Amino acid sequence: SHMGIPPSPPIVSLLHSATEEQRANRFVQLVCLISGYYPENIAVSWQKNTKTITSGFATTSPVKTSSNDFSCASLLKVPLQEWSRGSVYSCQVSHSATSSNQRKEIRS
């Protein structure tokens, strides 16, 4: 018997906001929320319309929730232009400890 926290796969949720400053500064903010995973080790990657996204994204350092969990957010600013081309944006989350590969897609 060796105790320990069960590894758990991240809960992944992709969210959009297009408010006024956002619409004005000619961009659109997407949040890839990744929460509830243990251990911390994750790989995050963004795609547009099948194909990868090279830059324009930051991922926050993870925080430890009250659940002995980790949450973090991956932040992508997408050109407002590029938002109604009927573009599909996806983030993909990898968690080796749980052998988990996750993805959520979002479109205009």
Added chain:
Amino acid sequence: SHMGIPPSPPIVSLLHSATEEQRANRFVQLVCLISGYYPENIAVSWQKNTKTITSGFATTSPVKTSSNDFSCASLLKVPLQEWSRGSVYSCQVSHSATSSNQRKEIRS
């Protein structure tokens, strides 16, 4: 003449997700996205139905965007029970350098 980045007020956006793990684990995830502020100094506070929220929330460490900007996220898990009581949740963002007090509200 002394150069420097103009102080800029945070763009504030409150977002909800209620997916399956979320609906199952009997909670609902709210994200208070705070992006595009300089300097970093901010105060974040959550409320429910006028009245403050004591705990259940983590705020990520801020990241430096490509704009010489800071973005961070404040993460609140709200009881699914507490979500359709027609409860209003608000986060409030303070930025002294810009003399800015911001708030966004969200409900079920």
